[PDB]
Design a protein around this ligand. Structure first.
Ligand SMILES: COc1ccccc1CN
Length: 458
Protein backbone atom coordinates (compact mmCIF):
# COMPACT_ATOMS: atom_id res chain seq x y z
CA UNK A 1 0.00 0.00 0.00
CA UNK A 2 1.63 3.23 1.20
CA UNK A 3 4.40 3.75 3.73
CA UNK A 4 6.87 1.25 5.09
CA UNK A 5 5.63 -0.54 8.21
CA UNK A 6 7.45 -1.93 11.23
CA UNK A 7 6.40 -5.46 10.25
CA UNK A 8 8.43 -4.94 7.08
CA UNK A 9 11.28 -3.02 8.68
CA UNK A 10 12.03 -5.67 11.35
CA UNK A 11 12.88 -8.10 8.52
CA UNK A 12 15.84 -5.88 7.42
CA UNK A 13 18.68 -6.07 6.69
CA UNK A 14 18.19 -8.58 3.84
CA UNK A 15 21.39 -10.63 4.01
CA UNK A 16 20.45 -13.76 2.05
CA UNK A 17 18.12 -15.35 -0.45
CA UNK A 18 15.99 -16.72 2.42
CA UNK A 19 15.80 -13.26 4.03
CA UNK A 20 14.26 -11.93 0.79
CA UNK A 21 11.87 -14.89 0.65
CA UNK A 22 10.81 -14.22 4.24
CA UNK A 23 10.05 -10.59 3.36
CA UNK A 24 7.89 -11.78 0.44
CA UNK A 25 6.13 -14.34 2.66
CA UNK A 26 5.17 -11.57 5.11
CA UNK A 27 3.93 -9.23 2.37
CA UNK A 28 1.84 -11.97 0.74
CA UNK A 29 -0.09 -12.33 4.01
CA UNK A 30 -1.15 -8.69 3.77
CA UNK A 31 -4.31 -7.94 1.85
CA UNK A 32 -2.27 -5.38 -0.09
CA UNK A 33 1.38 -6.42 -0.61
CA UNK A 34 3.58 -3.37 -1.21
CA UNK A 35 4.56 -3.51 -4.91
CA UNK A 36 7.08 -0.62 -4.57
CA UNK A 37 8.89 -2.22 -1.61
CA UNK A 38 9.09 -5.66 -3.21
CA UNK A 39 10.16 -4.36 -6.63
CA UNK A 40 12.91 -2.19 -5.13
CA UNK A 41 14.23 -5.14 -3.13
CA UNK A 42 14.30 -7.46 -6.18
CA UNK A 43 15.88 -4.80 -8.43
CA UNK A 44 18.54 -4.02 -5.83
CA UNK A 45 19.41 -7.70 -5.32
CA UNK A 46 19.42 -8.44 -9.04
CA UNK A 47 21.52 -5.35 -9.82
CA UNK A 48 24.44 -6.43 -7.66
CA UNK A 49 24.16 -10.18 -8.36
CA UNK A 50 23.98 -10.02 -12.18
CA UNK A 51 27.75 -9.50 -12.39
CA UNK A 52 30.54 -12.03 -12.76
CA UNK A 53 32.52 -12.22 -9.55
CA UNK A 54 35.39 -13.76 -7.67
CA UNK A 55 34.16 -15.26 -4.41
CA UNK A 56 32.32 -18.53 -3.85
CA UNK A 57 29.62 -16.98 -1.70
CA UNK A 58 28.19 -13.51 -2.12
CA UNK A 59 24.97 -11.76 -1.31
CA UNK A 60 24.51 -7.96 -1.56
CA UNK A 61 23.04 -6.73 1.72
CA UNK A 62 19.80 -4.78 1.28
CA UNK A 63 20.17 -2.27 4.12
CA UNK A 64 16.88 -0.67 5.14
CA UNK A 65 18.27 2.87 4.91
CA UNK A 66 19.03 2.31 1.20
CA UNK A 67 15.68 0.69 0.35
CA UNK A 68 13.68 3.20 2.43
CA UNK A 69 15.44 6.14 0.78
CA UNK A 70 14.61 4.81 -2.69
CA UNK A 71 11.03 4.09 -1.58
CA UNK A 72 10.68 7.67 -0.28
CA UNK A 73 11.99 9.04 -3.58
CA UNK A 74 9.42 7.07 -5.59
CA UNK A 75 6.60 8.10 -3.29
CA UNK A 76 7.62 11.77 -3.19
CA UNK A 77 7.84 11.85 -6.99
CA UNK A 78 4.35 10.35 -7.34
CA UNK A 79 2.57 12.27 -4.53
CA UNK A 80 4.19 15.49 -5.72
CA UNK A 81 3.07 15.15 -9.34
CA UNK A 82 -0.50 13.79 -8.96
CA UNK A 83 -2.99 16.02 -7.14
CA UNK A 84 -5.87 13.69 -6.28
CA UNK A 85 -8.25 16.57 -5.52
CA UNK A 86 -8.42 17.32 -9.27
CA UNK A 87 -9.76 13.80 -10.00
CA UNK A 88 -13.02 12.74 -8.32
CA UNK A 89 -13.23 9.07 -7.36
CA UNK A 90 -16.84 7.84 -7.70
CA UNK A 91 -16.82 5.10 -5.08
CA UNK A 92 -13.51 3.28 -5.54
CA UNK A 93 -13.44 3.65 -9.34
CA UNK A 94 -10.53 5.61 -10.78
CA UNK A 95 -11.25 7.65 -13.89
CA UNK A 96 -9.47 7.27 -17.22
CA UNK A 97 -8.15 10.80 -16.70
CA UNK A 98 -6.50 9.96 -13.38
CA UNK A 99 -5.12 6.65 -14.65
CA UNK A 100 -3.72 8.43 -17.70
CA UNK A 101 -2.16 11.17 -15.56
CA UNK A 102 -0.24 8.61 -13.51
CA UNK A 103 0.82 6.88 -16.72
CA UNK A 104 2.15 10.20 -18.01
CA UNK A 105 4.02 10.90 -14.73
CA UNK A 106 5.93 7.63 -15.17
CA UNK A 107 6.39 8.11 -18.92
CA UNK A 108 7.72 11.68 -18.67
CA UNK A 109 10.30 10.53 -16.09
CA UNK A 110 12.02 8.08 -18.42
CA UNK A 111 15.41 8.93 -19.87
CA UNK A 112 15.04 9.79 -23.55
CA UNK A 113 17.78 7.55 -25.00
CA UNK A 114 18.71 3.93 -24.21
CA UNK A 115 18.45 -6.12 -19.55
CA UNK A 116 17.89 -5.54 -15.79
CA UNK A 117 15.76 -2.41 -16.28
CA UNK A 118 12.48 -4.06 -15.32
CA UNK A 119 12.31 -2.96 -11.66
CA UNK A 120 11.47 0.25 -9.82
CA UNK A 121 15.12 0.16 -8.68
CA UNK A 122 16.10 0.88 -12.27
CA UNK A 123 13.36 3.51 -12.50
CA UNK A 124 14.54 5.44 -9.43
CA UNK A 125 18.30 5.15 -9.79
CA UNK A 126 18.69 5.41 -13.55
CA UNK A 127 15.35 6.59 -15.01
CA UNK A 128 15.27 3.46 -17.25
CA UNK A 129 12.49 0.89 -17.70
CA UNK A 130 11.74 -1.79 -20.27
CA UNK A 131 8.28 -2.06 -21.84
CA UNK A 132 6.37 -4.14 -19.30
CA UNK A 133 8.41 -2.42 -16.56
CA UNK A 134 6.64 0.83 -17.42
CA UNK A 135 3.21 -0.77 -16.98
CA UNK A 136 4.29 -2.28 -13.66
CA UNK A 137 5.62 1.11 -12.57
CA UNK A 138 2.19 2.59 -13.34
CA UNK A 139 0.39 0.01 -11.19
CA UNK A 140 2.87 0.52 -8.34
CA UNK A 141 2.39 4.27 -8.68
CA UNK A 142 -1.39 3.87 -8.47
CA UNK A 143 -1.10 1.63 -5.38
CA UNK A 144 1.11 4.34 -3.86
CA UNK A 145 -1.85 6.69 -4.44
CA UNK A 146 -4.56 4.42 -3.02
CA UNK A 147 -6.15 3.45 -6.35
CA UNK A 148 -7.11 -0.05 -5.30
CA UNK A 149 -8.81 -0.75 -8.64
CA UNK A 150 -5.82 -0.16 -10.95
CA UNK A 151 -4.27 -3.49 -11.92
CA UNK A 152 -1.77 -4.97 -14.31
CA UNK A 153 -3.01 -6.83 -17.39
CA UNK A 154 -0.71 -9.22 -19.26
CA UNK A 155 -0.84 -11.09 -22.50
CA UNK A 156 1.98 -13.41 -23.60
CA UNK A 157 4.00 -10.51 -25.05
CA UNK A 158 2.52 -7.22 -23.81
CA UNK A 159 1.28 -5.42 -20.70
CA UNK A 160 -1.21 -2.66 -19.93
CA UNK A 161 -3.53 -1.65 -17.08
CA UNK A 162 -7.15 -2.40 -16.22
CA UNK A 163 -9.29 -0.46 -13.76
CA UNK A 164 -12.87 0.31 -12.76
CA UNK A 165 -15.29 -2.40 -11.61
CA UNK A 166 -13.90 -5.90 -12.28
CA UNK A 167 -11.23 -4.39 -14.50
CA UNK A 168 -13.84 -3.26 -17.04
CA UNK A 169 -11.70 -0.33 -18.20
CA UNK A 170 -8.45 -0.80 -20.10
CA UNK A 171 -5.67 1.66 -20.90
CA UNK A 172 -2.40 1.36 -22.78
CA UNK A 173 0.49 2.75 -20.75
CA UNK A 174 3.63 1.57 -22.56
CA UNK A 175 5.08 0.73 -25.97
CA UNK A 176 5.29 -2.59 -27.80
CA UNK A 177 7.83 -3.70 -30.39
CA UNK A 178 10.15 -1.16 -32.01
CA UNK A 179 8.73 1.04 -34.77
CA UNK A 180 5.07 0.92 -33.82
CA UNK A 181 2.82 3.94 -33.30
CA UNK A 182 2.13 4.92 -29.71
CA UNK A 183 -1.24 3.78 -28.36
CA UNK A 184 -0.93 5.09 -24.78
CA UNK A 185 -4.25 6.18 -23.30
CA UNK A 186 -6.24 4.00 -25.72
CA UNK A 187 -8.28 0.89 -24.82
CA UNK A 188 -7.13 -2.59 -25.89
CA UNK A 189 -10.51 -3.16 -27.59
CA UNK A 190 -9.10 -2.84 -31.12
CA UNK A 191 -6.39 -5.38 -30.32
CA UNK A 192 -8.94 -7.87 -28.96
CA UNK A 193 -11.19 -7.41 -31.99
CA UNK A 194 -8.45 -7.79 -34.61
CA UNK A 195 -7.96 -11.37 -33.31
CA UNK A 196 -4.19 -10.83 -32.93
CA UNK A 197 -2.14 -13.13 -30.72
CA UNK A 198 -0.84 -10.01 -28.97
CA UNK A 199 -4.19 -9.45 -27.24
CA UNK A 200 -5.22 -13.11 -26.89
CA UNK A 201 -8.82 -12.58 -28.11
CA UNK A 202 -9.54 -10.96 -24.75
CA UNK A 203 -8.27 -14.05 -22.87
CA UNK A 204 -5.42 -12.16 -21.20
CA UNK A 205 -4.54 -12.05 -17.52
CA UNK A 206 -6.09 -9.50 -15.14
CA UNK A 207 -4.01 -9.44 -11.95
CA UNK A 208 -4.92 -8.94 -8.35
CA UNK A 209 -2.15 -7.50 -6.14
CA UNK A 210 -0.75 -10.94 -5.45
CA UNK A 211 -0.59 -11.89 -9.11
CA UNK A 212 1.30 -8.63 -9.57
CA UNK A 213 3.83 -9.98 -7.07
CA UNK A 214 4.01 -13.13 -9.18
CA UNK A 215 4.67 -10.96 -12.25
CA UNK A 216 7.64 -9.20 -10.64
CA UNK A 217 9.03 -12.56 -9.54
CA UNK A 218 8.67 -13.91 -13.08
CA UNK A 219 10.36 -10.70 -14.27
CA UNK A 220 13.57 -11.53 -12.38
CA UNK A 221 16.33 -11.79 -14.99
CA UNK A 222 19.24 -13.99 -13.78
CA UNK A 223 21.21 -13.50 -17.03
CA UNK A 224 24.69 -12.10 -16.45
CA UNK A 225 26.00 -12.41 -20.02
CA UNK A 226 25.35 -14.56 -23.11
CA UNK A 227 27.02 -17.58 -21.45
CA UNK A 228 26.24 -17.14 -17.74
CA UNK A 229 23.23 -17.07 -15.41
CA UNK A 230 23.32 -16.04 -11.75
CA UNK A 231 22.57 -19.14 -9.70
CA UNK A 232 21.56 -17.04 -6.71
CA UNK A 233 18.93 -15.21 -8.78
CA UNK A 234 17.64 -18.53 -10.18
CA UNK A 235 17.36 -19.99 -6.69
CA UNK A 236 15.66 -16.81 -5.44
CA UNK A 237 13.13 -16.79 -8.31
CA UNK A 238 12.53 -20.51 -7.79
CA UNK A 239 11.85 -20.22 -4.04
CA UNK A 240 9.59 -17.20 -4.56
CA UNK A 241 7.56 -19.08 -7.18
CA UNK A 242 7.05 -22.02 -4.78
CA UNK A 243 5.90 -19.59 -2.11
CA UNK A 244 3.44 -18.11 -4.61
CA UNK A 245 2.44 -21.60 -5.76
CA UNK A 246 1.65 -22.69 -2.20
CA UNK A 247 -0.60 -19.68 -1.54
CA UNK A 248 -2.57 -20.33 -4.77
CA UNK A 249 -1.31 -17.22 -6.55
CA UNK A 250 -0.05 -19.14 -9.60
CA UNK A 251 -3.43 -20.86 -10.11
CA UNK A 252 -4.33 -18.43 -12.94
CA UNK A 253 -0.78 -17.72 -14.17
CA UNK A 254 0.24 -20.30 -16.79
CA UNK A 255 3.57 -18.74 -17.77
CA UNK A 256 4.65 -18.66 -14.12
CA UNK A 257 3.87 -22.37 -13.87
CA UNK A 258 5.91 -23.01 -17.02
CA UNK A 259 8.75 -20.92 -15.57
CA UNK A 260 8.67 -22.97 -12.37
CA UNK A 261 8.66 -26.23 -14.33
CA UNK A 262 11.76 -24.99 -16.21
CA UNK A 263 13.45 -24.15 -12.90
CA UNK A 264 12.59 -27.58 -11.48
CA UNK A 265 14.05 -29.11 -14.66
CA UNK A 266 17.26 -27.18 -13.99
CA UNK A 267 17.32 -27.97 -10.26
CA UNK A 268 14.64 -30.25 -8.76
CA UNK A 269 13.38 -29.35 -5.25
CA UNK A 270 12.99 -32.38 -2.94
CA UNK A 271 9.39 -33.41 -2.41
CA UNK A 272 7.85 -31.13 -5.07
CA UNK A 273 5.89 -32.07 -8.23
CA UNK A 274 8.09 -32.94 -11.19
CA UNK A 275 8.39 -30.62 -14.22
CA UNK A 276 5.91 -32.61 -16.33
CA UNK A 277 3.25 -32.24 -13.64
CA UNK A 278 3.95 -28.50 -13.58
CA UNK A 279 3.86 -28.05 -17.37
CA UNK A 280 0.49 -29.79 -17.44
CA UNK A 281 -0.78 -27.69 -14.53
CA UNK A 282 0.13 -24.70 -16.70
CA UNK A 283 -1.86 -26.12 -19.61
CA UNK A 284 -4.76 -26.88 -17.23
CA UNK A 285 -4.73 -23.29 -16.00
CA UNK A 286 -4.89 -22.01 -19.58
CA UNK A 287 -7.83 -24.29 -20.41
CA UNK A 288 -9.65 -23.43 -17.17
CA UNK A 289 -9.26 -19.65 -17.05
CA UNK A 290 -8.26 -18.59 -20.55
CA UNK A 291 -10.37 -20.73 -22.97
CA UNK A 292 -7.27 -22.71 -24.03
CA UNK A 293 -6.19 -19.73 -26.12
CA UNK A 294 -2.57 -19.38 -24.87
CA UNK A 295 0.41 -20.52 -26.94
CA UNK A 296 3.27 -20.73 -24.43
CA UNK A 297 1.77 -23.50 -22.21
CA UNK A 298 2.33 -25.93 -25.08
CA UNK A 299 5.66 -24.32 -26.11
CA UNK A 300 6.91 -24.90 -22.55
CA UNK A 301 5.91 -28.57 -22.69
CA UNK A 302 7.31 -29.02 -26.20
CA UNK A 303 10.72 -27.61 -25.22
CA UNK A 304 10.94 -30.02 -22.29
CA UNK A 305 10.15 -33.06 -24.43
CA UNK A 306 12.62 -31.79 -27.03
CA UNK A 307 15.47 -31.49 -24.51
CA UNK A 308 14.76 -35.01 -23.20
CA UNK A 309 14.54 -36.48 -26.73
CA UNK A 310 10.88 -37.47 -26.32
CA UNK A 311 10.48 -36.67 -30.02
CA UNK A 312 6.87 -37.86 -30.36
CA UNK A 313 5.50 -35.82 -27.46
CA UNK A 314 7.56 -32.81 -28.58
CA UNK A 315 5.91 -32.94 -32.00
CA UNK A 316 2.56 -33.58 -30.32
CA UNK A 317 2.95 -30.50 -28.11
CA UNK A 318 4.12 -28.38 -31.06
CA UNK A 319 1.06 -29.45 -33.04
CA UNK A 320 -1.11 -28.42 -30.07
CA UNK A 321 0.64 -25.06 -30.28
CA UNK A 322 -0.36 -24.81 -33.96
CA UNK A 323 -3.89 -25.98 -33.12
CA UNK A 324 -4.18 -22.96 -30.79
CA UNK A 325 -2.64 -20.39 -33.14
CA UNK A 326 -4.79 -21.42 -36.13
CA UNK A 327 -7.72 -19.50 -34.64
CA UNK A 328 -5.76 -16.21 -34.63
CA UNK A 329 -4.94 -13.70 -37.37
CA UNK A 330 -1.26 -12.79 -37.79
CA UNK A 331 -1.02 -9.04 -37.20
CA UNK A 332 1.92 -6.64 -37.40
CA UNK A 333 2.96 -6.74 -33.75
CA UNK A 334 2.67 -10.56 -33.48
CA UNK A 335 6.33 -11.02 -34.49
CA UNK A 336 7.54 -12.73 -31.30
CA UNK A 337 5.23 -15.71 -31.76
CA UNK A 338 6.07 -15.76 -35.48
CA UNK A 339 9.81 -16.01 -34.72
CA UNK A 340 9.05 -18.90 -32.37
CA UNK A 341 7.06 -20.83 -34.98
CA UNK A 342 9.77 -20.08 -37.55
CA UNK A 343 12.51 -21.41 -35.27
CA UNK A 344 10.48 -24.52 -34.44
CA UNK A 345 9.57 -25.21 -38.08
CA UNK A 346 12.87 -24.38 -39.78
CA UNK A 347 15.51 -25.10 -37.10
CA UNK A 348 14.41 -27.15 -34.08
CA UNK A 349 12.30 -29.79 -35.85
CA UNK A 350 14.79 -30.37 -38.73
CA UNK A 351 17.53 -30.86 -36.13
CA UNK A 352 15.37 -33.27 -34.13
CA UNK A 353 14.54 -35.28 -37.27
CA UNK A 354 18.15 -35.16 -38.52
CA UNK A 355 19.29 -36.55 -35.16
CA UNK A 356 16.59 -39.21 -35.49
CA UNK A 357 17.84 -40.08 -38.98
CA UNK A 358 21.36 -40.53 -37.60
CA UNK A 359 20.01 -42.88 -34.92
CA UNK A 360 18.49 -45.15 -37.56
CA UNK A 361 21.95 -45.25 -39.23
CA UNK A 362 23.01 -47.54 -36.36
CA UNK A 363 19.83 -49.10 -34.95
CA UNK A 364 11.62 -48.29 -32.86
CA UNK A 365 12.51 -44.74 -33.87
CA UNK A 366 10.14 -41.83 -34.46
CA UNK A 367 10.91 -41.63 -38.20
CA UNK A 368 9.26 -45.04 -38.56
CA UNK A 369 6.26 -43.89 -36.50
CA UNK A 370 3.19 -42.66 -38.42
CA UNK A 371 1.85 -40.83 -35.34
CA UNK A 372 4.87 -38.51 -35.38
CA UNK A 373 4.24 -37.84 -39.05
CA UNK A 374 0.62 -37.02 -38.17
CA UNK A 375 1.74 -34.55 -35.50
CA UNK A 376 4.08 -32.96 -38.05
CA UNK A 377 1.17 -32.53 -40.46
CA UNK A 378 -1.18 -31.11 -37.82
CA UNK A 379 1.54 -28.60 -36.94
CA UNK A 380 1.77 -27.31 -40.51
CA UNK A 381 -2.00 -27.36 -40.92
CA UNK A 382 -2.44 -25.04 -37.93
CA UNK A 383 0.12 -22.58 -39.31
CA UNK A 384 -1.51 -22.53 -42.76
CA UNK A 385 -4.93 -22.05 -41.13
CA UNK A 386 -3.38 -19.31 -38.96
CA UNK A 387 -2.37 -17.50 -42.15
CA UNK A 388 -5.93 -17.56 -43.47
CA UNK A 389 -7.75 -14.34 -42.70
CA UNK A 390 -4.46 -12.69 -41.77
CA UNK A 391 -3.42 -9.34 -43.27
CA UNK A 392 0.29 -10.15 -43.95
CA UNK A 393 1.47 -13.59 -45.13
CA UNK A 394 3.15 -16.19 -42.90
CA UNK A 395 4.70 -18.83 -45.11
CA UNK A 396 7.40 -18.26 -47.72
CA UNK A 397 10.00 -20.19 -49.69
CA UNK A 398 12.13 -20.89 -46.62
CA UNK A 399 9.29 -22.68 -44.81
CA UNK A 400 8.74 -24.82 -47.91
CA UNK A 401 12.40 -25.90 -47.99
CA UNK A 402 12.23 -27.42 -44.51
CA UNK A 403 8.71 -28.81 -44.86
CA UNK A 404 10.01 -30.73 -47.90
CA UNK A 405 13.09 -31.80 -45.94
CA UNK A 406 10.98 -32.79 -42.91
CA UNK A 407 8.46 -34.83 -44.92
CA UNK A 408 11.39 -36.63 -46.52
CA UNK A 409 12.62 -37.77 -43.10
CA UNK A 410 9.86 -40.41 -43.17
CA UNK A 411 9.82 -43.46 -45.44
CA UNK A 412 7.05 -43.20 -48.02
CA UNK A 413 5.78 -46.47 -46.57
CA UNK A 414 5.58 -44.81 -43.14
CA UNK A 415 3.79 -41.68 -44.36
CA UNK A 416 1.33 -43.83 -46.32
CA UNK A 417 -0.09 -45.35 -43.12
CA UNK A 418 -1.73 -42.05 -42.09
CA UNK A 419 -5.26 -41.26 -43.30
CA UNK A 420 -5.83 -37.58 -44.17
CA UNK A 421 -9.44 -36.35 -44.01
CA UNK A 422 -10.53 -32.92 -45.23
CA UNK A 423 -13.09 -30.62 -43.61
CA UNK A 424 -3.46 -46.41 -38.25
CA UNK A 425 -3.78 -42.73 -37.31
CA UNK A 426 -6.46 -40.59 -38.97
CA UNK A 427 -6.10 -36.81 -39.22
CA UNK A 428 -8.43 -34.02 -40.39
CA UNK A 429 -6.95 -30.96 -42.09
CA UNK A 430 -8.42 -27.48 -41.58
CA UNK A 431 -6.50 -25.19 -43.98
CA UNK A 432 -7.00 -24.77 -47.71
CA UNK A 433 -3.26 -25.12 -48.36
CA UNK A 434 -2.73 -28.43 -46.58
CA UNK A 435 -5.94 -29.86 -48.04
CA UNK A 436 -4.71 -28.60 -51.42
CA UNK A 437 -1.49 -30.64 -51.26
CA UNK A 438 -2.92 -33.55 -49.24
CA UNK A 439 -2.10 -35.80 -52.20
CA UNK A 440 1.54 -34.71 -52.45
CA UNK A 441 2.13 -35.46 -48.75
CA UNK A 442 1.78 -39.25 -49.06
CA UNK A 443 3.44 -40.07 -52.40
CA UNK A 444 6.48 -42.36 -52.06
CA UNK A 445 8.43 -39.62 -53.86
CA UNK A 446 7.78 -36.02 -52.83
CA UNK A 447 7.18 -33.42 -55.53
CA UNK A 448 9.29 -30.75 -53.82
CA UNK A 449 8.66 -28.07 -56.44
CA UNK A 450 4.91 -28.76 -56.33
CA UNK A 451 4.60 -28.59 -52.54
CA UNK A 452 6.80 -25.48 -52.51
CA UNK A 453 4.46 -23.40 -54.68
CA UNK A 454 1.31 -24.72 -52.97
CA UNK A 455 2.55 -23.87 -49.47
CA UNK A 456 3.48 -20.41 -50.83
CA UNK A 457 0.34 -19.79 -52.91
CA UNK A 458 -1.79 -16.76 -52.04
C1 LIG B 1 8.04 -21.08 -23.47
O1 LIG B 1 8.73 -20.22 -24.38
C2 LIG B 1 8.82 -18.90 -24.05
C3 LIG B 1 8.28 -18.34 -22.90
C4 LIG B 1 8.42 -16.99 -22.66
C5 LIG B 1 9.09 -16.19 -23.56
C6 LIG B 1 9.63 -16.74 -24.71
C7 LIG B 1 9.50 -18.10 -24.98
C8 LIG B 1 10.08 -18.71 -26.22
N1 LIG B 1 11.43 -19.26 -26.00
Amino acid sequence: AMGLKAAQKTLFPLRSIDDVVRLFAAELGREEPDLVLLSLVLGFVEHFLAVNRVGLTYFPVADLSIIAALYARFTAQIRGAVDLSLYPREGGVSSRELVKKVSDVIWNSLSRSYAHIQSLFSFITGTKLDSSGVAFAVVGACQALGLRDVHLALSEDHAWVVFGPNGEQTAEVTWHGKGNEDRRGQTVNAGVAERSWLYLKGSYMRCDRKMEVAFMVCAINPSIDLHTDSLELLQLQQKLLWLLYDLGHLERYPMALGNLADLEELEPTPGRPDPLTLYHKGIASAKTYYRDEHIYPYMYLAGYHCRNRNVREALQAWADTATVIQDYNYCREDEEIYKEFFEVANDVIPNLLKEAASLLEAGGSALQDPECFAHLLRFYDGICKWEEGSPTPVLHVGWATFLVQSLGRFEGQVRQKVRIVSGGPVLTFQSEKMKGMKELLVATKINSSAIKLQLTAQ
